[PDB]
Design a protein around this nucleic acid. Structure first.
Ligand SMILES: [Mg+2]
Ligand SMILES: [Mg+2]
Ligand SMILES: [Mg+2]
Ligand SMILES: [Mg+2]
Ligand SMILES: [Mg+2]
Ligand SMILES: [Mg+2]
Ligand SMILES: [Mg+2]
Ligand SMILES: [Mg+2]
Ligand SMILES: [Mg+2]
Ligand SMILES: [Mg+2]
Ligand SMILES: [Mg+2]
Ligand SMILES: [Mg+2]
Ligand SMILES: [Mg+2]
Ligand SMILES: [Mg+2]
Ligand SMILES: [Mg+2]
Ligand SMILES: [Mg+2]
Ligand SMILES: [Mg+2]
Ligand SMILES: [Mg+2]
Ligand SMILES: [Mg+2]
Ligand SMILES: [Mg+2]
Ligand SMILES: [Mg+2]
Ligand SMILES: [Mg+2]
Ligand SMILES: [Mg+2]
Ligand SMILES: [Mg+2]
Ligand SMILES: [Mg+2]
Ligand SMILES: [Mg+2]
Ligand SMILES: [Mg+2]
Ligand SMILES: [Mg+2]
Ligand SMILES: [Mg+2]
Ligand SMILES: [Mg+2]
Ligand SMILES: [Mg+2]
Ligand SMILES: [Mg+2]
Ligand SMILES: [Mg+2]
Ligand SMILES: [Mg+2]
Ligand SMILES: [Mg+2]
Ligand SMILES: [Mg+2]
Ligand SMILES: [Mg+2]
Ligand SMILES: [Mg+2]
Ligand SMILES: [Mg+2]
Ligand SMILES: [Mg+2]
Ligand SMILES: [Mg+2]
Ligand SMILES: [Mg+2]
Ligand SMILES: [Mg+2]
Ligand SMILES: [Mg+2]
Ligand SMILES: [Mg+2]
Ligand SMILES: [Mg+2]
Ligand SMILES: [Mg+2]
Ligand SMILES: [Mg+2]
Ligand SMILES: [Mg+2]
Ligand SMILES: [Mg+2]
Ligand SMILES: [Mg+2]
Ligand SMILES: [Mg+2]
Ligand SMILES: [Mg+2]
Ligand SMILES: [Mg+2]
Ligand SMILES: [Mg+2]
Ligand SMILES: [Mg+2]
Ligand SMILES: [Mg+2]
Ligand SMILES: [Mg+2]
Ligand SMILES: [Mg+2]
Ligand SMILES: [Mg+2]
Ligand SMILES: [Mg+2]
Ligand SMILES: [Mg+2]
Ligand SMILES: [Mg+2]
Ligand SMILES: [Mg+2]
Ligand SMILES: [Mg+2]
Ligand SMILES: [Mg+2]
Ligand SMILES: [Mg+2]
Ligand SMILES: [Mg+2]
Ligand SMILES: [Mg+2]
Ligand SMILES: [Mg+2]
Ligand SMILES: [Mg+2]
Ligand SMILES: [Mg+2]
Ligand SMILES: [Mg+2]
Ligand SMILES: [Mg+2]
Ligand SMILES: [Mg+2]
Ligand SMILES: [Mg+2]
Ligand SMILES: [Mg+2]
Ligand SMILES: [Mg+2]
Ligand SMILES: [Mg+2]
Ligand SMILES: [Mg+2]
Ligand SMILES: [Mg+2]
Ligand SMILES: [Mg+2]
Ligand SMILES: [Mg+2]
Ligand SMILES: [Mg+2]
Ligand SMILES: [Mg+2]
Ligand SMILES: [Mg+2]
Ligand SMILES: [Mg+2]
Ligand SMILES: [Mg+2]
Ligand SMILES: [Mg+2]
Ligand SMILES: [Mg+2]
Ligand SMILES: [Mg+2]
Ligand SMILES: [Mg+2]
Ligand SMILES: [Mg+2]
Ligand SMILES: [Mg+2]
Ligand SMILES: [Mg+2]
Ligand SMILES: [Mg+2]
Ligand SMILES: [Mg+2]
Ligand SMILES: [Mg+2]
Ligand SMILES: [Mg+2]
Ligand SMILES: [Mg+2]
Ligand SMILES: [Mg+2]
Ligand SMILES: [Mg+2]
Ligand SMILES: [Mg+2]
Ligand SMILES: [Mg+2]
Ligand SMILES: [Mg+2]
Ligand SMILES: [Mg+2]
Ligand SMILES: [Mg+2]
Ligand SMILES: [Mg+2]
Ligand SMILES: [Mg+2]
Ligand SMILES: [Mg+2]
Ligand SMILES: [Mg+2]
Ligand SMILES: [Mg+2]
Ligand SMILES: [Mg+2]
Ligand SMILES: [Mg+2]
Ligand SMILES: [Mg+2]
Ligand SMILES: [Mg+2]
Ligand SMILES: [Mg+2]
Ligand SMILES: [Mg+2]
Ligand SMILES: [Mg+2]
Ligand SMILES: [Mg+2]
Ligand SMILES: [Mg+2]
Ligand SMILES: [Mg+2]
Ligand SMILES: [Mg+2]
Ligand SMILES: [Mg+2]
Ligand SMILES: [Mg+2]
Ligand SMILES: [Mg+2]
Ligand SMILES: [Mg+2]
Ligand SMILES: [Mg+2]
Ligand SMILES: [Mg+2]
Ligand SMILES: [Mg+2]
Ligand SMILES: [Mg+2]
Ligand SMILES: [Mg+2]
Ligand SMILES: [Mg+2]
Ligand SMILES: [Mg+2]
Length: 249
RNA sequence: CCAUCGACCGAUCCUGAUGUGUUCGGAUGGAUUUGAGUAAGAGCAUAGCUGUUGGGACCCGAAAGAUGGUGAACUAUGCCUGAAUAGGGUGAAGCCAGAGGAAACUCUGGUGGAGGCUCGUAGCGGUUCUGACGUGCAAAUCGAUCGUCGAAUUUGGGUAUAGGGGCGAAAGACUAAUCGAACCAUCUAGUAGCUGGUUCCUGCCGAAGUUUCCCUCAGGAUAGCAGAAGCUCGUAUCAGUUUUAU
RNA sequence: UUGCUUAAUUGAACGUGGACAAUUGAAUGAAGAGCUUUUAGUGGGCCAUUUUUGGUAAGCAGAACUGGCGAUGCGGGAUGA
RNA sequence: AGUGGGGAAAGGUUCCAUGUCAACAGCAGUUGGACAUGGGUUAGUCGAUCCUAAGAGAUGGGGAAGCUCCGUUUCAACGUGCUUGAUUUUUCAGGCCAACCAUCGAAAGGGAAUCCGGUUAAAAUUCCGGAACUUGGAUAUGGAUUCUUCACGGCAACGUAACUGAAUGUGGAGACGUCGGCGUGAGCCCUGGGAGGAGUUAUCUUUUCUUCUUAACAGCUUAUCACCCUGGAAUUGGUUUAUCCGGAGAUGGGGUCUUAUGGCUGGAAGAGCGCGGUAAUUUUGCCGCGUCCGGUGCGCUUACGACGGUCCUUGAAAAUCCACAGGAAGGAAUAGUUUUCAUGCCAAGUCGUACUCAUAACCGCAGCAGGUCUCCAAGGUUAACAGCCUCUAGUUGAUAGAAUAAUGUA
RNA sequence: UGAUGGUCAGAAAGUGAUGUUGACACAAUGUGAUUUCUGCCCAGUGCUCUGAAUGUCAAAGUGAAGAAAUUCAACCAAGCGCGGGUAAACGGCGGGAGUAACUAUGACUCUCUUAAGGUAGCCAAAUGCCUCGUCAUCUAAUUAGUGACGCGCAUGAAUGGAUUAACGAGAUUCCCACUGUCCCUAUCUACUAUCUAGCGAAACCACAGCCAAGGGAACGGGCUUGGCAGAAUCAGCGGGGAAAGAAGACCCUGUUGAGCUUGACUCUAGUUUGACAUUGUGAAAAGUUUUUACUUAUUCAAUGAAGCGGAGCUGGAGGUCAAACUCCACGUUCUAGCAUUAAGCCCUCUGGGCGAUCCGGGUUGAAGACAUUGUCAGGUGGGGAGUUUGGCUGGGGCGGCACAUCUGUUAAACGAUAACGCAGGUGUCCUAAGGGGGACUCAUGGAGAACAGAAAUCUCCAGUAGAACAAAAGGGUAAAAGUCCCCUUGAUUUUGAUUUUCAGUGUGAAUACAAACCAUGAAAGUGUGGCCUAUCGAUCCUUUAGUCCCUCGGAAUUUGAGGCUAGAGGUGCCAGAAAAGUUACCACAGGGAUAACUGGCUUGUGGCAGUCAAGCGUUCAUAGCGACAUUGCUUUUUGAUUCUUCGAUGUCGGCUCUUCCUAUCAUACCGAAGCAGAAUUCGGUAAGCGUUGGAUUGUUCACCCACUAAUAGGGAACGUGAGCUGGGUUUAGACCGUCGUGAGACAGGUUAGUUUUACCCUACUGAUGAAUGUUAUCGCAAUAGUAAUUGAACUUAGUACGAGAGGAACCGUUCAUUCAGAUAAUUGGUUUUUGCGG
RNA sequence: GGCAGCUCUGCUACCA
């Protein structure tokens, strides 16, 4: 047969992300002396739309502690953050929406976003619109914090990892139907080349494991082993179960 | 030279003398066994015809396979930067005014100018005539008719993706008139039990389509049938026939 | 002659020596008999008489013997392997 | 929405003049994109050149037997650094920084600066005449400023001929989708008077057609929006085609600003245009007159403006230029400073530039009914940039003659 | 899938895409707006989940034996197995009988059985074979359409079920309007064609070009026999040249491919699991293993390597029970401002210290001897690679085995002899069912004997085998070859010869001896498996036995290995490859050795016609029929065959047009009747002449409606595609149902799908034309062609005939149908009269 | 043909 559409994406010729209009990478500040020992104050200059992103971004200006210079940061805007607001980041920052605090400095039940998986990676968890991270508890002896991720998973993170207080702005986006193929076209025009999708069952046997037949049908189980190889992993990969989800999981 | 019975040498089997590193030796006598042997050498070398095998292999002929390269001037898709798209119809929100109601609210007239809306040009496409043409104007065009015509629109240029690879709103489609695996050169005079051809004269002889074996059944080998060279001899004793006896 | 065989001096096989001469033991014929090497093409067949199997039959399919066509012209069957 | 006038790609001399007809132009040929000989493309301002885009790609490194692959500042000791006071001791003294930063990548993106009239057989935003502009450099005079050293005025918005300002920093411009109606301008269309020229005139027609124009650049003036001062608003008012605004200060009164756009003047009538009268084999003219004053709009095209709608779509970058913050350093009185005020001086290299752009200059074997990106766009009819007729411009090219059976094609 | 990640890329990499990303995300799939719903099944195949105990279980490692190679054993990862989950995973979703005060049905019951047995819905639907289902409606008539019905070959629920407004160059039916689509054609215009001047190709071409019949490769231009036959030609035309275009694309063959699939054969990138290495330093506990401590190897990340680690200054605290130890902090939080090139103090040294605490120069985190990487080892791996996927055959395929074989027959009295001929058999079975010896006689019948009878056991007689001998059939056998008894292993050893098949090769099987050693019998003798004819297997490799022999090549010993001779392990496609599919996307070499048309032979079958005459026909065989039988014809059916064509003869039907046949439907003339008339039936000469308009269907066929004198049947390459058309079939797109794991299949349904060339020769239709002294006019007529057809009305006549009911015909008259040949008065149509008007 | 459990199921192995 032929190389299937799954495998052509790794080469990344026409499958790279369309990034001309993007407004910068959304990251926290580099963890420095001020954030480790006290707090540093910045001011929100802009709240802007980032193409390909549901969450708006905030442009926050900080002073450089060591040279006469202004540093502009690109944060993910939490809902309620406004232009001209003062943003405080550090160990001694107060528990206000938009402030960046270490996870150990936040009491249980604190809603936090753009949380660091590892100390200083500048934000990994809960970055999309309407999403957040809940702080479950602390383990001060081991310097660890328990959090709940938007997927429902419980994670143990260093208490020195940082997060931004509040919920990511732009939530409720999925509640409205797109209603049109053109709307999805414009949605993916600034994301990547993944739309529209032809069904593999509608192809020929060269194109896909599902192609061929005198009727459109998969022919074999569409649940594929985790240990299958590239060109085989088309369908439900390592599916623990199938069918309509009934009851609680 | 022919037929036949013997003899000798080697192997195999049997017997087993004087003797002895007591386990070796193997005299002697045998055997419906066996060798491409001995039995007063015939070979070696050169050349010629014919036949054989490997080689391009009598000549021309695949569909394929491999190695290394060249193409995105067509086209497919993404990206970057530009450009293009008469005139109408319909009349969404929002807004103004009036009327009715206890309230919750309702009705009417305007205004407004929404929509992968609609009629319809340019444009883009290509339904039907199964029209023309069909050694064409044209290796896809011409005419009428038709789809769509403000967006998933059309399009220039730049740029990216390269052959078991790309790209595909998916037809095995498109990837320079080439695609169910492009093009170029080479391996390569690839192999072919298959098709075609195979060049002067006369003289003499002259077939087979049958046996057996074969993944054998359009092919081979084998035996037969045929030619050539002769050799040993010269009526020796043979015959697709009869008779007699059985 | 033998180591085979017989109760044997019997036999078996192969012999020495002697006799039977062209009517040397039927016909007819005999461009002579015997022997060897090597190699070609072929290995689709078909037809006629007679015998014969399957089939309703077939210019059908399958065997037997012979003769033909193939490979072959010539006279006849008008024409025709 | 051309058979008009230009261009991009592509071609490459096809351009122009002269000669010329063997071949080619599927008839012809005296003609030609054919053949032969010559001629022809003029730039500081138009492009390239420079910038960065998607991307391409050296170096330091790391793979790979290797051809080479990855990577693009990457695990790198990465400046052929600058700015000054200089020194004439051709030595220096230092003062700042070195995040990022090889390079290539657009004749449609960004971007310093030019227009009009004339001129050739063929070139022209390139030549000639005149009139400007930008950048780089040099540099003097005038003006400006200083004894209160680095100017004044205005309540203010802000004004001006000028009117210090290093390192470093902050901003702005470059720099940005699309649609809808509205408003203003420009060009075109329409039209009145007057001064000319042409046409019709049996009859009619104070008639029909036509000329009456004004570049870049310089000065003054000119605007929606926005802003300032005054004042204090319900009986709410102002206000758009579109309902938004006002105690976070409306209406009213008075001002400030951007100069898009228009007006006046200079450029500039001397030019061009339209007439009339004369010169002459005649290179080429010479003379006179006029070139003026209006109006109109759901008009067309286009530019701009203030608005409004739209998106799970929010619609490049960089070079480059400026301003501001900062206060380093240097500054006067018998004299000091500055080329962001005026005037004056010098220079601007290299390459492209002819012509076609298509029913004959490109690609389809060809002078092929195919294909190939874009700009300008008159009158009538009309909803209309449709169809139909016409003006300017351009073509009249496609073998032809004679007949008019059948069968065709339309 | 929470980043030490998922998905994907790369030969590798200090390498990449998603990713300027972070579950409202990225990646992978299925279904396909809305509405209403998405039932039951986890047995199968997948996927997934745990492993406390656990079958299998690689390399390394461990233990034992051995002189060692080596062997054996224990242990033993993942995987598999075991257990669970999962269908909006792949998928699946049953049969048989009885039953209700008529019948029908079966609410109900019984019975087999599954993982579950098709739920809600829907339907002769694009899915139903039968089938043109049945009913209704639509029409004059409907294989079409629509509405119902439903034991539905084979409907059915995100392999989505049922609906559905709007939309559609999608498929279909009906109605109005409209019309040359048609009845049924006519006329007009331009451009061709045509003729001329100029210019000027190509396809194609063995030679060529008139027919009929024959034979012939079974459809001739040539050959044979006939008809005939007279220069040179022009415009048309499409009968023929099995016309041209292309080494058939269907079919088969080839030890030719390729695309695709899978549980084919053989591998493989990747991935996973173990071991060793990288790999070091400690502690503890289990018997080397487990755990956790260190950091410097290694790995991850960030930064313009900016503030790390420890200690000390300052406050806030503990209640201080010595003496200040322990803990915390140690300059910034109403506001969209500002923060940059140190002030100040101290020592003098255009400079140093403090401001700005000291010390360690570890940039800072994470991770850590685990990852990672290298090398082996096991698993997984149609993602990919390579290859394979018998033969015969009345085409192939399916079936069968006629593939190694045995008996009888075919088989034609030696031997041999074929077919997918006929009736059958073999892949075994037997320590006796082998060998020897001895004794006996079998099947069956009759006559007798308690229970006892047709069949128990006993007795006699008869008994040529009518029994038995392992198994097919044939042969053979009587003091035996059969039955019973006794003893045995000759079913042994060595190696030759011979017979059959035959090449006089192998294999199988068998025969007669030689040399041994035995069994049995008194002995002669017999015995080298089965009474005879079938009952079976090479090279290479392995294994065993024998000889204990030969060799391991520098010389030895002992292991091990290799030789020699004989068996065994097996090839059944049986003289003996190691082997799954699909192609409707297809390719190549060929084949008329071979299928799908026509043609040819045949004529079973189809159709048609005779002979006989038992019966039918009130009686009566034969007016008209005619059983049981029997003889033919035809080639308008379908078979059978495979002769022609596979370097191609265009394969359905219709339209159009001509001709022919007769087995005559009508029309002319007649004979017969169970012929009164009328009608009808049977028959003769007869093909002169006609044989229709429509609904449904692609249809041939069919079936209705209707008219008619009648609505006969056929042929001409199943006439006729360079005549058309293209509805069907039968390329490639797509849907459904059933089948298949799948790619895919269906001779099932459905929808969309390029129809090319004549200008040559001939033939046909027309048109000229040399020369028969020239020219003109008028003629003759050989030969060829030929043409008319049918009905109605009136009259005869309400007559003949007839009980009546009914009810003709000839002569004649007027019209009409179909056809033919003209013509343009009239009427209509046509208009470039561009004539006139608008 | 090896293991192992309940006459036998499961796993593993395959040069005539
Ligand atoms: Mg989707
Ligand atoms: Mg899809
Ligand atoms: Mg498809
Ligand atoms: Mg596949
Ligand atoms: Mg699969
Ligand atoms: Mg499939
Ligand atoms: Mg489907
Ligand atoms: Mg000799
Ligand atoms: Mg070749
Ligand atoms: Mg090749
Ligand atoms: Mg190969
Ligand atoms: Mg291109
Ligand atoms: Mg419009
Ligand atoms: Mg067209
Ligand atoms: Mg056509
Ligand atoms: Mg034509
Ligand atoms: Mg149109
Ligand atoms: Mg492009
Ligand atoms: Mg297909
Ligand atoms: Mg192509
Ligand atoms: Mg050759
Ligand atoms: Mg062959
Ligand atoms: Mg001879
Ligand atoms: Mg074989
Ligand atoms: Mg042949
Ligand atoms: Mg030979
Ligand atoms: Mg031979
Ligand atoms: Mg043959
Ligand atoms: Mg021959
Ligand atoms: Mg002869
Ligand atoms: Mg003769
Ligand atoms: Mg004859
Ligand atoms: Mg010229
Ligand atoms: Mg010419
Ligand atoms: Mg000429
Ligand atoms: Mg020239
Ligand atoms: Mg310029
Ligand atoms: Mg330059
Ligand atoms: Mg870049
Ligand atoms: Mg390097
Ligand atoms: Mg550049
Ligand atoms: Mg440029
Ligand atoms: Mg731009
Ligand atoms: Mg530009
Ligand atoms: Mg000029
Ligand atoms: Mg010019
Ligand atoms: Mg000049
Ligand atoms: Mg002043
Ligand atoms: Mg200018
Ligand atoms: Mg002026
Ligand atoms: Mg425009
Ligand atoms: Mg100046
Ligand atoms: Mg020019
Ligand atoms: Mg053209
Ligand atoms: Mg070319
Ligand atoms: Mg225009
Ligand atoms: Mg027009
Ligand atoms: Mg022409
Ligand atoms: Mg003409
Ligand atoms: Mg699904
Ligand atoms: Mg639906
Ligand atoms: Mg299940
Ligand atoms: Mg299961
Ligand atoms: Mg092991
Ligand atoms: Mg295990
Ligand atoms: Mg049901
Ligand atoms: Mg049904
Ligand atoms: Mg149907
Ligand atoms: Mg109908
Ligand atoms: Mg019906
Ligand atoms: Mg129905
Ligand atoms: Mg079903
Ligand atoms: Mg379901
Ligand atoms: Mg279904
Ligand atoms: Mg509907
Ligand atoms: Mg429709
Ligand atoms: Mg559409
Ligand atoms: Mg003609
Ligand atoms: Mg014949
Ligand atoms: Mg003939
Ligand atoms: Mg012929
Ligand atoms: Mg003749
Ligand atoms: Mg013809
Ligand atoms: Mg013709
Ligand atoms: Mg062929
Ligand atoms: Mg073969
Ligand atoms: Mg193959
Ligand atoms: Mg292929
Ligand atoms: Mg650091
Ligand atoms: Mg390790
Ligand atoms: Mg695989
Ligand atoms: Mg494969
Ligand atoms: Mg076969
Ligand atoms: Mg079979
Ligand atoms: Mg046979
Ligand atoms: Mg065989
Ligand atoms: Mg015989
Ligand atoms: Mg056997
Ligand atoms: Mg016995
Ligand atoms: Mg016996
Ligand atoms: Mg006996
Ligand atoms: Mg023999
Ligand atoms: Mg045998
Ligand atoms: Mg014996
Ligand atoms: Mg030796
Ligand atoms: Mg040695
Ligand atoms: Mg054996
Ligand atoms: Mg074997
Ligand atoms: Mg065989
Ligand atoms: Mg054989
Ligand atoms: Mg098929
Ligand atoms: Mg044949
Ligand atoms: Mg017949
Ligand atoms: Mg018959
Ligand atoms: Mg009777
Ligand atoms: Mg045939
Ligand atoms: Mg053929
Ligand atoms: Mg033909
Ligand atoms: Mg042909
Ligand atoms: Mg007759
Ligand atoms: Mg008759
Ligand atoms: Mg006739
Ligand atoms: Mg019909
Ligand atoms: Mg026929
Ligand atoms: Mg026919
Ligand atoms: Mg024809
Ligand atoms: Mg045709
Ligand atoms: Mg069709
Ligand atoms: Mg099809
Ligand atoms: Mg299935
Ligand atoms: Mg179509
Ligand atoms: Mg009467
Ligand atoms: Mg007529
Ligand atoms: Mg007129």
């Amino acid at each position: 047969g032929r190389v299937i559409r799954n495998q052509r994406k790794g080469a990344g010729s026409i499958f790279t992300s369309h990034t001309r209009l993007r407004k910068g990478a959304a990251k926290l500040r580099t963890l420095d002396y001020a954030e480790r020992h006290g707090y540093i104050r910045g001011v929100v200059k802009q709240i802007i739309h980032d193409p390909g992103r549901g969450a708006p971004l905030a442009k926050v200006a900080f002073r450089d502690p060591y040279k006469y210079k202004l540093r502009e940061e690109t944060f993910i805007a939490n809902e309620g953050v406004y232009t001209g607001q003062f943003i405080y980041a550090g160990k001694k920052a107060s528990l206000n929406v938009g402030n960046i605090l270490p996870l150990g400095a936040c009491p249980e039940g604190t809603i936090v976003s753009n949380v660091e998986e590892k100390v200083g990676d500048r934000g990994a968890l809960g970055r999309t619109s309407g999403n957040y991270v809940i702080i479950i508890g602390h383990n001060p002896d081991e310097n660890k914090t328990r959090v709940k991720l938007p997927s429902g998973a419980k994670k143990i993170i260093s208490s020195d990892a940082r997060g931004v207080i509040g919920v990511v702005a732009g939530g409720g986006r999925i509640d409205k139907p797109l209603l049109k193929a053109g709307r999805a076209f414009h949605k993916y025009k600034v994301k990547r080349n993944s739309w529209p999708k032809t069904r593999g069952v509608a192809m020929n046997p060269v194109d896909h494991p599902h192609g061929g037949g005198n009727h459109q049908h998969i022919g074999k189980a569409s649940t594929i082993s985790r240990g299958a190889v590239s060109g085989q992993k088309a369908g439900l990969i390592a599916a623990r179960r199938t069918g309509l989800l009934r009851g609680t999981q």
